[PDB]
Amino acid sequence: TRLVEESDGLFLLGAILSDTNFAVSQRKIDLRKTIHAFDRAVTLGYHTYADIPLAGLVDALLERLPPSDRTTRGKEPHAYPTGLQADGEPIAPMDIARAVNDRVRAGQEPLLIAADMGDCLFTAMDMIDAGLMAPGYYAGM
Amino acid sequence: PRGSHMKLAEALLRALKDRGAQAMFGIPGDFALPFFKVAEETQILPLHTLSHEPAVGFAADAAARYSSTLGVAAVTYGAGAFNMVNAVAGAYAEKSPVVVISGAPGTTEGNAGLLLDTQFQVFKEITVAQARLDDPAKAPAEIARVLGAARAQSRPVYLEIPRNMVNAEVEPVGDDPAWPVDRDALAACADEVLAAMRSATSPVLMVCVEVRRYGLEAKVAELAQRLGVPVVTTFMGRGLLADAPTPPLGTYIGVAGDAEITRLVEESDGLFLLGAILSDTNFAVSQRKIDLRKTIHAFDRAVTLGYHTYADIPLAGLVDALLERLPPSDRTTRGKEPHAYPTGLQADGEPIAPMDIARAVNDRVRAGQEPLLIAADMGDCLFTAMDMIDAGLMAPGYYAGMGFGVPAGIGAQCVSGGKRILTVVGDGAFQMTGWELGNCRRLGIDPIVILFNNASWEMLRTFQPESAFNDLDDWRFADMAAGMGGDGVRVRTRAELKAALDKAFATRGRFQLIEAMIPRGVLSDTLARFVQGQK
Amino acid sequence: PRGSHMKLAEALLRALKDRGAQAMFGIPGDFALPFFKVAEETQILPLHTLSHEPAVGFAADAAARYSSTLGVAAVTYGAGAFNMVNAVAGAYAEKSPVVVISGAPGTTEGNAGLLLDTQFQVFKEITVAQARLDDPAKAPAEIARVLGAARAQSRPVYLEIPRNMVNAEVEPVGDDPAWPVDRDALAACADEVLAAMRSATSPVLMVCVEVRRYGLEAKVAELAQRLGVPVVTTFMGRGLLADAPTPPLGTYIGVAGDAEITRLVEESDGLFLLGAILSDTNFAVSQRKIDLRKTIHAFDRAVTLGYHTYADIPLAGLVDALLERLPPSDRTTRGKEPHAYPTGLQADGEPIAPMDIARAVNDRVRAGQEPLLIAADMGDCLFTAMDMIDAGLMAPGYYAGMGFGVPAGIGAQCVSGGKRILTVVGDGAFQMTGWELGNCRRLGIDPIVILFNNASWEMLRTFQPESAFNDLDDWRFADMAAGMGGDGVRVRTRAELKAALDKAFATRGRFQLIEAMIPRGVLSDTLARFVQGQK
Amino acid sequence: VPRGSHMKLAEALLRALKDRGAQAMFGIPGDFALPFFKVAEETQILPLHTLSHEPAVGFAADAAARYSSTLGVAAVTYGAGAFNMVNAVAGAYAEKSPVVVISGAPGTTEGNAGLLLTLDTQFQVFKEITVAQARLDDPAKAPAEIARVLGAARAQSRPVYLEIPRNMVNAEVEPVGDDPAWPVDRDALAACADEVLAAMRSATSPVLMVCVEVRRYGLEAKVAELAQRLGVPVVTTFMGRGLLADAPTPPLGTYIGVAGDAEITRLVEESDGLFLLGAILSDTNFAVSQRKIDLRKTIHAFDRAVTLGYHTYADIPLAGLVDALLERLPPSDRTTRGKEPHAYPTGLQADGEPIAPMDIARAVNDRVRAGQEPLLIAADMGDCLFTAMDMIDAGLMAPGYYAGMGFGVPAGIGAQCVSGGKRILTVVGDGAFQMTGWELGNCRRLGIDPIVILFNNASWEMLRTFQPESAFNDLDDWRFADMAAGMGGDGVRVRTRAELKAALDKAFATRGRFQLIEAMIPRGVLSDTLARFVQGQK
Numbered sequence A: 001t002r003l004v005e006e007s008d009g010l011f012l013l014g015a016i017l018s019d020t021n022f023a024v025s026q027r028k029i030d031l032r033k034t035i036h037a038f039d040r041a042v043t044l045g046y047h048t049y050a051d052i053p054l055a056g057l058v059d060a061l062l063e064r065l066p067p068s069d070r071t072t073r074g075k076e077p078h079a080y081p082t083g084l085q086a087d088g089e090p091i092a093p094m095d096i097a098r099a100v101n102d103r104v105r106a107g108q109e110p111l112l113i114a115a116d117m118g119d120c121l122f123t124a125m126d127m128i129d130a131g132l133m134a135p136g137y138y139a140g141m
Numbered sequence B, C: 001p002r003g004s005h006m007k008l009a010e011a012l013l014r015a016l017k018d019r020g021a022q023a024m025f026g027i028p029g030d031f032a033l034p035f036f037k038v039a040e041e042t043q044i045l046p047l048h049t050l051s052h053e054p055a056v057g058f059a060a061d062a063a064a065r066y067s068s069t070l071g072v073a074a075v076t077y078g079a080g081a082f083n084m085v086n087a088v089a090g091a092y093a094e095k096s097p098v099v100v101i102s103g104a105p106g107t108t109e110g111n112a113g114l115l116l117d118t119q120f121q122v123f124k125e126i127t128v129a130q131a132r133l134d135d136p137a138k139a140p141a142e143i144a145r146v147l148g149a150a151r152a153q154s155r156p157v158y159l160e161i162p163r164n165m166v167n168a169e170v171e172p173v174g175d176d177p178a179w180p181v182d183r184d185a186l187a188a189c190a191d192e193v194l195a196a197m198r199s200a201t202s203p204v205l206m207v208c209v210e211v212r213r214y215g216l217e218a219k220v221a222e223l224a225q226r227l228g229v230p231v232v233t234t235f236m237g238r239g240l241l242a243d244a245p246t247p248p249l250g251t252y253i254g255v256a257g258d259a260e261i262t263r264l265v266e267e268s269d270g271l272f273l274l275g276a277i278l279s280d281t282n283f284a285v286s287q288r289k290i291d292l293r294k295t296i297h298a299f300d301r302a303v304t305l306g307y308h309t310y311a312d313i314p315l316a317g318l319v320d321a322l323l324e325r326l327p328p329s330d331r332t333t334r335g336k337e338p339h340a341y342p343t344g345l346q347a348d349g350e351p352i353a354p355m356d357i358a359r360a361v362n363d364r365v366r367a368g369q370e371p372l373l374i375a376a377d378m379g380d381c382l383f384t385a386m387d388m389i390d391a392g393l394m395a396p397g398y399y400a401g402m403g404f405g406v407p408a409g410i411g412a413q414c415v416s417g418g419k420r421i422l423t424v425v426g427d428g429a430f431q432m433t434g435w436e437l438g439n440c441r442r443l444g445i446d447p448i449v450i451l452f453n454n455a456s457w458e459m460l461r462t463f464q465p466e467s468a469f470n471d472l473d474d475w476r477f478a479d480m481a482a483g484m485g486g487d488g489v490r491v492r493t494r495a496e497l498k499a500a501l502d503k504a505f506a507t508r509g510r511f512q513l514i515e516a517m518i519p520r521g522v523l524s525d526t527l528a529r530f531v532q533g534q535k
Numbered sequence D: 001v002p003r004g005s006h007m008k009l010a011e012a013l014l015r016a017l018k019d020r021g022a023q024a025m026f027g028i029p030g031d032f033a034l035p036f037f038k039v040a041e042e043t044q045i046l047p048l049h050t051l052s053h054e055p056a057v058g059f060a061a062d063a064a065a066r067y068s069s070t071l072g073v074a075a076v077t078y079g080a081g082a083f084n085m086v087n088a089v090a091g092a093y094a095e096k097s098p099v100v101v102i103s104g105a106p107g108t109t110e111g112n113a114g115l116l117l118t119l120d121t122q123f124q125v126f127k128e129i130t131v132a133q134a135r136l137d138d139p140a141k142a143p144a145e146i147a148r149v150l151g152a153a154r155a156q157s158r159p160v161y162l163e164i165p166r167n168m169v170n171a172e173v174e175p176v177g178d179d180p181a182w183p184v185d186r187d188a189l190a191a192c193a194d195e196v197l198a199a200m201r202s203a204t205s206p207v208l209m210v211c212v213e214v215r216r217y218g219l220e221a222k223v224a225e226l227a228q229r230l231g232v233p234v235v236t237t238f239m240g241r242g243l244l245a246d247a248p249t250p251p252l253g254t255y256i257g258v259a260g261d262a263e264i265t266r267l268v269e270e271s272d273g274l275f276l277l278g279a280i281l282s283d284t285n286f287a288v289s290q291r292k293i294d295l296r297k298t299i300h301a302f303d304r305a306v307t308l309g310y311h312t313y314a315d316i317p318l319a320g321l322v323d324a325l326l327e328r329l330p331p332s333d334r335t336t337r338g339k340e341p342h343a344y345p346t347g348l349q350a351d352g353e354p355i356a357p358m359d360i361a362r363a364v365n366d367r368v369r370a371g372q373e374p375l376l377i378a379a380d381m382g383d384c385l386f387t388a389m390d391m392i393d394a395g396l397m398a399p400g401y402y403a404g405m406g407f408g409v410p411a412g413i414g415a416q417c418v419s420g421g422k423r424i425l426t427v428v429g430d431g432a433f434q435m436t437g438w439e440l441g442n443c444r445r446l447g448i449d450p451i452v453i454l455f456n457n458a459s460w461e462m463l464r465t466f467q468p469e470s471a472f473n474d475l476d477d478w479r480f481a482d483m484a485a486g487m488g489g490d491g492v493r494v495r496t497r498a499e500l501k502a503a504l505d506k507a508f509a510t511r512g513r514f515q516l517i518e519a520m521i522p523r524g525v526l527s528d529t530l531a532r533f534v535q536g537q538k
Ligand SMILES: Cc1ncc(Cc2c([C@H](C)O)sc(CCOP(=O)(O)OP(=O)(O)O)c2C)c(N)n1
Pocket: B378, B379, B380, B381, B400, B401, B402, B403, B425, B426, B427, B428, B429, B430, B452, B454, B456, B457, B458, B459, B460
């Protein structure tokens, strides 16, 4: 959150901008230093370039950048909760996350997850998936 | 003088109660939480929540129709409000004043351009008046204007309330602004209408939806007696003037109705459509089937005949003006024989057909049971309910949208003050909104629901039998009833049906679901006549 | 097929030209610069700039009226557009289709909340249709819809163009969307109107503003001949049917007009107001002075009589329908004596009175000068111009707003194709907009302007003589003329007046300003009759 | 129905206005307004000044309000008269000036001319450009309505609208009382004041901006005290120009966007603690734009609310916020005064070369440096305004945010009408003069003698700078100086710097008649501020 919101060169490549649930909000970033490529247009330095498809912009940037072997891979970012205590205590959302993750760590290929709006979605954010589909911005149940 | 003030939300709730609203149905959301807090804390109007927004809209519509007053449907900004568009369109279509109250972002919260407002624009298409209450100084007058429009045109209205305005101090809401009438135009209108009714060889007075919505039954019974012409009701005027000196000869529902009634209406050269919705809809009076050079259409505060229109003529005003020009009368037609309803259910081991369901209900009534108001969904359940003895029939007869049934029965029973409601619904429609019955326990009601399960979208099969997509699975609805707090029973024979209906009426406290298995290809008599008529 | 496209601004200009627009008047600004660039570069429509926005609006209105076509007024966002609100309201009031085109911030430039849009909302109150052209895909259809409304109702419309949309590629603009008419309703309307005219003891056909705006003079001359009833014009119908088989008996202008004409109109029991603006305005036909149970009001695409209205009836359609129901005729009334205008100016050393100005103009005409169209401002100059022989009279006769005069004369001469225009204006009105004459050199025109200088707001003194605030200073207008490129001359005697008018007509190339000194307390005959009538 | 007060409704209104500081009433009558103007003229409660065209009525009233930080009064007639003042009123709304619009109207029992189709078109249009409106058609309710509406104009410093049916002008009414009280959340005020101080203390580069509301509400003394105690850099917006000039911690300069001083612009735009005290926020000409600053680190106190840290505190009057902050800050002797910020151009070369805008600035400044007490300047929109930014003044009144033309001459007139003899210097371009400069014809009757410098470049030059390729920005030659005599003033056309110098001296030495100096300027020659403005758009 800090990295994004304090950026003085935020390149939003294909982002929805809105003050709704999980979306990047115009109120949390500095639009003055933001490059917003979306809806076939690109906005930066106070002005907007019209008729610029996202695929075209990416190709144009690639044509201006030399190849690189740069690699920043490392051990997993964001630790997924594991180790469900299968006992007689009541269930909490995090226990459901651990139950799902333990199966995956034990060898189950992850499933794509469809989530509704509610804590079910907030819990799914901590589940190992093969894709997550949910109304993260619209937030409609 | 006065100098008092209250929270905007409270002023709105009291204004609604001042106009007869009996409850507030709704589903909250973050933007609407503050408004729901005021509703719950003040207790000005009973607050009933439902599971899904369609039901909130249908329940508010049903409550409005039940008491001929304003209905109140509260939702949250975005998905909540958009999810009630169909129910509100249905209320608009059938002239029911549902007041839509949506929460919204605060006036300082700028915007939320996910859809770039769109919600306001969409609701403008399905309501007669709207207002975003973002100015405490003008809020009271805007509330009176919008609620006044709902009452004047008997159609839905939209109120959007920024959440930071919920607690803004405002002056109390006054009376609806007046929609004054030109006395001279009104006189001219009444004079022409009366002259037209007197010159017709076959004048007919049709008593319709607006008569009920505006509570003009007594005045129209008097008008009907004095005018001295045959009285007929439209589908939405069903039951009106039943206790009048000159009760309706019957109800016009188009091709599937009584041929004598249909002809009387369609061949009239002085068809006085008093408050009628006109449309090429199934059970409605259609402009295509009547003589437009002779029809007198009093509707939406206007009167049209001979292709010309008298504007700003409220139905109530027209009726009073006609009464002033007619001498009293002692004429009556109440010596005639009553309507013959299908009765005599054969409680045997034979499978169930829609008409058997009609007979089952009617027999209990003949045996002494006071009739129950019936809420019907769209489907053969409605065509079947038309042959049932009722204490009113609430159904999307013109709009024809599915899902209305169960939520309407729920909304009606919430404001019936103890009167039990009978709901009829098909399997297709039940799959949409029958689940709302899980709310009966909290709401403290126990409607009786007869579910017509033919594992099919049967009205569609009938029009296109060669298609396989109308073949639905067998959902075990009766078995699912206990899970949502009701008593369910699946019946397959007329005998089980007879027994199950008696048991339902004898059991209070939990909704009673009677799942009637009906084979595909089997229809009510009214639907059959309807289908034949199309062919 | 086709597949061509052009800049949105160009598509709009061509659409205007396709509909008869002859020029574009305007004042640019930063937001409108791109649009003005396209107008100047493409040269689709002559681009004429003025000094102040009121004149832009008045000039566009005058051009629309001059050729009975669309007028075009281009302004910039904010102050530019707000500064033209009054001129546009005047055009709305007197049924003149001025197309208002305002530049606006680009679609990406977000907003400018100095007034928190407000401009759009304000213009919605004074136009019949509006559109913000912010979607190139839908721009062509929106332009056709809005321009189509201007033509259908003959009133101003508003088009807002975000500056980044000026150069957006769009498809060409097609024809106006059709506003189809119900043949049956039209037949019923024509039948009732004709029946009403035949049953009246004293039917009167009034030829009004819409007849001129919609170019129906020929068709109405034919209708008038066949109908066979007396013809009278309203102030805005002045001059219509002058060459018709049955020319108007005269013009109704209320209390100050011919008593015989006034009575004929007001006591008619079959007053056919063909295209009339109705209002309690000075020279207009007022609902308060006529028999509403017998008036037939054909206006704004509707026909009202007996307090009922036939909707969607275009004036042209009504006229054709009536013609289809009337037999031809060879009747004529052109054997009568012509109107008597005040003539015989005594070119002596006596001071000037308004009527002397009338005589001066009329004598030149009698001596052989072809009359000039007259543009008049509001004030005694208008009451005086009513007694002048003209080739048309353009004035705010109903709206009564000052400042119209000089800019209207300018706008008219810009599209008159060589015809010189005579403008009459008071000192008060000249102080407002007479300065626009400084633009004549660039525009290549040379109107003749007679300025009535009584160093007073004389119409106001007349109604309240005890006030001192109506006493204005003596501005030396003639002396200021050379500074803005014209030839000015101050005249104090009838002799100087006579000489100055001849000199003006003899001098072309520069506007000619004749500043006529008139003592306070001296009025035209028409204004005097008007004042007496009020008392 | 009231009876016996012996106080006409119109008189009660004029007195209510006077009670609140109004110093005059500008207007143009009409049939519907005649009875109201009669009461104004006969009672002389407020000096009555008529003008030629309604735009001037609105501009003059706005100027009178700005001049004395009080209510302005603009009276018009129903219909055309009122619609013709919509722009001037919108401009006052845009720049927070409380112009009280009073329009005559048909009597309550005579209906109206439905030419346009309270719900009347006029009322609906005015509701969009005013903060409160009232139709005084009920004598029993009029007193309270006037107090509510005039109170609204004073609470938010925006125009209001009053419509008076002509038959109500003389209706007896009870006296108008005090303004009703507007809400004030004392708890919110306390929390807000604490949060503001915390944010300013944690900021690396906090900046205090003194803006329009500070001037409108007469809070200069309190804000000077606050600025000294707060201890952060001080800057003013265009509408706050001149505020705190004599304080211990005066403004470092005035922020006006790219057109201004680069250092000032940088300080404001890079601030992580921008306290906008009473500022209009807009993307228009010289206003502080939400697009140039970081709203996340901005504290916006305006329109009786305060926004910071993503949230807004409602019902917090600016005066209350300032007092709350003072109560939380100990006294200080901190002083940051120093030699003049922003050097004013001087040393006009009075020779035979043509005139450039900067030469006009130097001519004016040299007189001041030679001992002439500065005059307040009224400027129209155009390079005349950009040039005025570099002129030593005793106040500058101009449409710096709204940027609507025509304000200039009428504002100078309105201001001098209430200046008690203090001469006003008006600067205006040729395009704007063609619109409303003619109002100078009213100077003699009004008893004023403004000095007017007309920048005649025969061009809509600011438009040329934006789109030089266009031919329509080329205007014709109008001999304005030659037309001055016809309007009762003295005019002179000057072409060289020497002629300019002489003409300015003559104008100043000649009172009694307005003095019009028509300065011929070649196209393509701009003031330094406009040049920076143009370069900044590249
Ligand atoms: C919301 C909605 N969706 C679709 C339809 C189309 C429709 C009918 C028409 C076109 O309105 S009839 C029908 C089948 C209803 O099935 P059911 O409830 O079980 O009763 P039955 O078996 O008697 O048909 C559908 C889907 C509708 N009316 N409303």
